[PDB]
Amino acid sequence: MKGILGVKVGMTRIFRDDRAVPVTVILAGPCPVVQRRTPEKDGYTAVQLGFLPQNPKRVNRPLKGHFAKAGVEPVRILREIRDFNPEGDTVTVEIFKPGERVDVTGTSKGRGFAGVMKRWNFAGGPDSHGAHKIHRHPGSIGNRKTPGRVYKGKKMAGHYGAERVTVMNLEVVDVIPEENLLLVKGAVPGPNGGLVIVRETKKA
Amino acid sequence: SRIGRLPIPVPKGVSVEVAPGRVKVKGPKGELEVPVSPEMRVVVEEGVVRVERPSDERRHKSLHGLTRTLIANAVKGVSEGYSKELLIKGIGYRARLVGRALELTVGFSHPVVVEPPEGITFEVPEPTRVRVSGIDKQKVGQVAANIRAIRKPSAYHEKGIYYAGEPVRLKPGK
Amino acid sequence: VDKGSYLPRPTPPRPI
Amino acid sequence: MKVRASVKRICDKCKVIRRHGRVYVICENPKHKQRQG
Amino acid sequence: MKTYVPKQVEPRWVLIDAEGKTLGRLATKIATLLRGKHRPDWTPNVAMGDFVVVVNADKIRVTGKKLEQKIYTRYSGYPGGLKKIPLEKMLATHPERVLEHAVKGMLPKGPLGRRLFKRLKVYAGPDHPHQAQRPEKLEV
RNA sequence: CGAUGUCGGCUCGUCGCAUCCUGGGGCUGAAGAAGGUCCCAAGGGUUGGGCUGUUCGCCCAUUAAAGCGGCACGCGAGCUG
RNA sequence: CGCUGAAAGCAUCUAAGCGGGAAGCCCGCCCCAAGAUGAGGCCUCCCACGGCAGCCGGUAAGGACCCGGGAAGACCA
Ligand SMILES: [Mg+2]
Ligand SMILES: [Mg+2]
Ligand SMILES: [Mg+2]
Ligand SMILES: [Mg+2]
Ligand SMILES: [Mg+2]
Ligand SMILES: [Mg+2]
Ligand SMILES: [Mg+2]
Ligand SMILES: [Mg+2]
Ligand SMILES: [Mg+2]
Ligand SMILES: [Mg+2]
Ligand SMILES: [Mg+2]
Ligand SMILES: [Mg+2]
Ligand SMILES: [Mg+2]
Ligand SMILES: [Mg+2]
Ligand SMILES: [Mg+2]
Ligand SMILES: [Mg+2]
Ligand SMILES: [Mg+2]
Ligand SMILES: [Mg+2]
Ligand SMILES: [Mg+2]
Ligand SMILES: [Mg+2]
Ligand SMILES: [Mg+2]
Ligand SMILES: [Mg+2]
Ligand SMILES: [Mg+2]
Ligand SMILES: [Mg+2]
Ligand SMILES: [Mg+2]
Ligand SMILES: [Mg+2]
Ligand SMILES: [Mg+2]
Ligand SMILES: [Mg+2]
Ligand SMILES: [Mg+2]
Ligand SMILES: [Mg+2]
Ligand SMILES: [Mg+2]
Ligand SMILES: [Mg+2]
Ligand SMILES: [Mg+2]
Ligand SMILES: [Mg+2]
Ligand SMILES: [Mg+2]
Ligand SMILES: [Mg+2]
Ligand SMILES: [Mg+2]
Ligand SMILES: [Mg+2]
Ligand SMILES: [Mg+2]
Ligand SMILES: [Mg+2]
Ligand SMILES: [Mg+2]
Ligand SMILES: [Mg+2]
Ligand SMILES: [Mg+2]
Ligand SMILES: [Mg+2]
Ligand SMILES: [Mg+2]
Ligand SMILES: [Mg+2]
Ligand SMILES: [Mg+2]
Ligand SMILES: [Mg+2]
Ligand SMILES: [Mg+2]
Ligand SMILES: [Mg+2]
Ligand SMILES: [Mg+2]
Ligand SMILES: [Mg+2]
Ligand SMILES: [Mg+2]
Ligand SMILES: [Mg+2]
Ligand SMILES: [Mg+2]
Ligand SMILES: [Mg+2]
Ligand SMILES: [Mg+2]
Ligand SMILES: [Mg+2]
Ligand SMILES: [Mg+2]
Ligand SMILES: [Mg+2]
Ligand SMILES: [Mg+2]
Ligand SMILES: [Mg+2]
Ligand SMILES: [Mg+2]
Ligand SMILES: [Mg+2]
Ligand SMILES: [Mg+2]
Ligand SMILES: [Mg+2]
Ligand SMILES: [Mg+2]
Ligand SMILES: [Mg+2]
Ligand SMILES: [Mg+2]
Ligand SMILES: [Mg+2]
Ligand SMILES: [Mg+2]
Ligand SMILES: [Mg+2]
Ligand SMILES: [Mg+2]
Ligand SMILES: [Mg+2]
Ligand SMILES: [Zn+2]
């Protein structure tokens, strides 16, 4: 159940069989395994992967010890992939071949305090015909005396975005190992520069 | 009028060993375990198994008959064995054996392949006749039913999978 | 379904 | 299947059965098949 | 003369094999033990019952058709959020919950009853980790 | 009655199931295709327009379908009027 | 809808047992989630400091403050 950490670098399109292919380019390799989680020890199976090298001046002592025990130079990010136990001490884009389908997790762009129309695609109010200061307002939020309260979960204004999102079953369009590049067809959560996780897909 | 009290002839040389709540029945064709209520007494006589019931309450009378027959069937199974014949009817309709498996051509856009479960043997003598055979009567009748279900007898035409000795009852169209 | 109105149309509160 | 509060035999070939807490009627004639409900 | 009030006592640990016992008829006894009402110095406003260990909870018994028909219920607060889980399934997934749930309902509501319930220790299967406590086996 | 704002619409739902569609099924005066009738099923879905303040209804053009009810005839300290 | 099968010599999907069977139910997918006070687990780091399950003081690993900012953001985070 292979996976890797990467940064989103940006989109373009490539031409493949006289077709424009929208792509997002991800820098994924190389990911040093820094701890393995096992059933005996940890109760389940996964690999803690590290990514991007860090200035040792910035790595405190409990962190250094962790790296040391793995004989791994310090790294900016540690993230596990579950039910994945690679043979090497290192995971690189090579675990993917063009044509495979992947799921990518990112942290989505953050919209801050969002209105009901941006967040939940609410209709809003009229813009004329008498609408009084309610053009983007939610309307009713309930009934009357029964039940006399608002459902847990009721769609309302509030923060929106900067959340974990996984887009699923994306085509792998190319991989360019000499540059640690994974070209995935479509759109991946988050800004350029943001951290992402690329897993083998759970769709069939 | 009564099944439980009727004794079970046990041919040479099938054996019947009683255990609390089961009877094991071995014969030339294999063995069978008969789960049997703690409440009935299964009794082993010379060349004869009998079952006896603790009282004349409805439940006991009910378990009684069931129990004799259940054992009697086990007995026959390890000696004679059990079988059911299926006839196929209708123009396109055929059966052939693919190794140990049963392949059925019955008008679908594909053929239907049935694997034998352990204890069951499939035989196709002619191509419109199938024979399901085994030592377990329920298992036989079941696998038979399964095969028939792939293409039940039509209501309008002698067409489909039939049990041997199953009457053809059609109804008119127009 | 139209039925009898039971209040007159209200006006905003007169100043207290 | 006919579903109704009054289930009865319709032909002499009709058989009243109790099955899983329910009254059914079975006949070789399919029209006569009934369960109480 | 005022009625006696016990100074703090050392609580006694007890062990109970649930196997084959009738769920409800075991639960009432566990409740008594937890309240501490077998003790002649019973005091209703202090925890002074036994700690109770139960094993083989997965092998509890139930009469009638309850495995199929007894339904446990949970409300999430959300629309449509009433989950119904039947005994069979609860035993097949969190068997210890069955006894736990039955004993819980037989303890007082309030701060003390909640505390009493924490003194119950239920395990599916024959073993438990309270060896250090050397719990006295009870037939009940 | 020292005030429980009252039709319809908009907005936003949520529930029931006597189910409109979709899934499963029995009977059919079920050849097939298409229907009818009953049973199980509430997961999701259930269009846009002309008229009229209308709810309802009729009509146009489509649809798998264009469901019926409850929530103070749901919702005016949310809007309309 | 069955298989096997008594009561009830036959029959019966049922009384013992076994099968098939829905967009529905449970799991599976995606997100939150240990205030899950039942407060889980694993890896790594510090250390057995002074004066008198308590107090007072200096530190350790670390943290905060302050600052330059940020597809994070109302302030906060
Ligand atoms: Mg664990
Ligand atoms: Mg991330
Ligand atoms: Mg933002
Ligand atoms: Mg808005
Ligand atoms: Mg949105
Ligand atoms: Mg929009
Ligand atoms: Mg709008
Ligand atoms: Mg608008
Ligand atoms: Mg308008
Ligand atoms: Mg106005
Ligand atoms: Mg305006
Ligand atoms: Mg109101
Ligand atoms: Mg209320
Ligand atoms: Mg945020
Ligand atoms: Mg290419
Ligand atoms: Mg970007
Ligand atoms: Mg003998
Ligand atoms: Mg005798
Ligand atoms: Mg006023
Ligand atoms: Mg009648
Ligand atoms: Mg008659
Ligand atoms: Mg009959
Ligand atoms: Mg006692
Ligand atoms: Mg008292
Ligand atoms: Mg559990
Ligand atoms: Mg209580
Ligand atoms: Mg009380
Ligand atoms: Mg009044
Ligand atoms: Mg008043
Ligand atoms: Mg007033
Ligand atoms: Mg009021
Ligand atoms: Mg509604
Ligand atoms: Mg219904
Ligand atoms: Mg249908
Ligand atoms: Mg037809
Ligand atoms: Mg016709
Ligand atoms: Mg016709
Ligand atoms: Mg029909
Ligand atoms: Mg019917
Ligand atoms: Mg529904
Ligand atoms: Mg619903
Ligand atoms: Mg609906
Ligand atoms: Mg016009
Ligand atoms: Mg109009
Ligand atoms: Mg109108
Ligand atoms: Mg009208
Ligand atoms: Mg249609
Ligand atoms: Mg319309
Ligand atoms: Mg109203
Ligand atoms: Mg009324
Ligand atoms: Mg309404
Ligand atoms: Mg209103
Ligand atoms: Mg108003
Ligand atoms: Mg209004
Ligand atoms: Mg209001
Ligand atoms: Mg108001
Ligand atoms: Mg209001
Ligand atoms: Mg109000
Ligand atoms: Mg509004
Ligand atoms: Mg006016
Ligand atoms: Mg039959
Ligand atoms: Mg039979
Ligand atoms: Mg008779
Ligand atoms: Mg049964
Ligand atoms: Mg069944
Ligand atoms: Mg079948
Ligand atoms: Mg679907
Ligand atoms: Mg998480
Ligand atoms: Mg915690
Ligand atoms: Mg956590
Ligand atoms: Mg709790
Ligand atoms: Mg913790
Ligand atoms: Mg700052
Ligand atoms: Mg700032
Ligand atoms: Zn009849």
Curated annotation (Swiss-Prot), chain A:
Gene3D superfamilies per UniProt: 3.30.160.810, Translation factors (2.40.30.10)
Record keywords, A-Z: Methylation, Ribonucleoprotein, Ribosomal protein, RNA-binding, rRNA-binding
This protein's GO CC annotations: cytosolic large ribosomal subunit
PROSITE patterns cross-referenced by the UniProt entry: RIBOSOMAL_L3 (PS00474)
Post-translational modification: The mass differences between the observed and calculated masses are suggested to be due to methylation, which is known to occur in the E.coli and R.palustris orthologs.
GO biological process, one term: translation
GO molecular function: rRNA binding; structural constituent of ribosome
Role summary: One of the primary rRNA binding proteins, it binds directly near the 3'-end of the 23S rRNA, where it nucleates assembly of the 50S subunit.
Subunit field text: Part of the 50S ribosomal subunit. Forms a cluster with proteins L14 and L19.
PANTHER family linked: 50S RIBOSOMAL PROTEIN L3, LARGE RIBOSOMAL SUBUNIT PROTEIN UL3C
Family membership: Belongs to the universal ribosomal protein uL3 family.
Name of this protein: Large ribosomal subunit protein uL3
Swiss-Prot record, chain B:
SS bond partners: none
CC terms in the record's Gene Ontology section: cytosolic large ribosomal subunit
A single BP term in Gene Ontology: cytoplasmic translation
GO MF entries: rRNA binding; structural constituent of ribosome
Keyword terms of this UniProt record: Ribonucleoprotein, Ribosomal protein, RNA-binding, rRNA-binding
UniProt xrefs under Pfam families: Ribosomal_L6
First and last residue of the signal peptide: none
Quaternary structure and partners: Part of the 50S ribosomal subunit.
PANTHER family reported in the protein's UniProt record: 60S/50S RIBOSOMAL PROTEIN L6/L9, LARGE RIBOSOMAL SUBUNIT PROTEIN UL6M
The family this protein is said to belong to: Belongs to the universal ribosomal protein uL6 family.
NCBIfam families attached to this UniProt entry: L6_bact (TIGR03654)
Function: This protein binds to the 23S rRNA, and is important in its secondary structure. It is located near the subunit interface in the base of the L7/L12 stalk, and near the tRNA binding site of the peptidyltransferase center.
Name of the protein: Large ribosomal subunit protein uL6
Organism: Thermus thermophilus (strain ATCC 27634 / DSM 579 / HB8)
Gene designation per UniProt: rplF
UniProtKB/Swiss-Prot annotation, chain C:
Keywords: Antibiotic, Antimicrobial, Glycoprotein, Immunity, Innate immunity, Secreted
Pro residues: bias regions: 9-16
Highest taxon listed in the record's lineage: Eukaryota
UniProt main location, coarse: secreted
Compartment(s) where it occurs, according to its Swiss-Prot or TrEMBL record: Secreted
GO CC annotation, single: extracellular region
Renumbered residue ranges of the record's region Disordered: 1-16
Glycosylated residues (UniProt): 11
Family of the protein in this entry: Belongs to the drosocin family.
UniProt-recorded name of the protein: Pyrrhocoricin
The species this protein was found in: Pyrrhocoris apterus
UniProtKB/Swiss-Prot annotation, chain D:
Cofactor annotation remark: Binds 1 zinc ion per subunit.
Single Gene Ontology BP annotation: translation
Keyword match Cell cycle: no
GO cellular component, one term: ribonucleoprotein complex
The entry's keywords: Metal-binding, Ribonucleoprotein, Ribosomal protein, Zinc
InterPro entries attached to this UniProt entry: Ribosomal_bL36, Ribosomal_bL36_sp
Residues holding Zn(2+): 11, 14, 27, 32
The organism's place on the tree of life at top rank: Bacteria
UniProt GO MF annotations: metal ion binding; structural constituent of ribosome
The keyword Disulfide bond is assigned to this record: no
SUPFAM superfamilies the UniProt entry points to: Ribosomal protein L36 (SSF57840)
Pfam family, one: Ribosomal_L36
Family to which the UniProt record says this protein belongs: Belongs to the bacterial ribosomal protein bL36 family.
Name used for this protein in its record: Large ribosomal subunit protein bL36
Organism: Thermus thermophilus (strain ATCC 27634 / DSM 579 / HB8)
Gene from which this protein is expressed: rpmJ
